[PDB]
C-alpha cells in the first residue's frame, strides 16, 4: 500500500512532479 516502491518514482517526486507541479505551481 504505502510500501509502493523505492525503485519507483526514482527522483522521489518522480522528477516530473518537482518539475511540472512546481512549473504550474506559479504560486510561490
Amino acid at each position: 500500500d504505502a510500501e509502493f516502491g523505492h525503485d519507483s518514482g526514482f527522483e522521489v517526486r518522480h522528477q516530473k512532479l518537482v518539475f511540472f507541479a512546481e512549473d504550474v505551481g506559479s504560486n510561490k
Side-chain angles (χ1 to χ4, degrees):
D1 304 34
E3 316 95 323
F4 196 78
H6 300 153
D7 150 83
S8 314
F10 72 110
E11 284 182 57
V12 184
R13 278 187 175 191
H14 300 252
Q15 169 275 333
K16 79 291 300 300
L17 198 155
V18 87
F19 277 57
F20 189 61
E22 218 137 277
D23 183 88
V24 305
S26 46
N27 265 240
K28 35 80 305 210

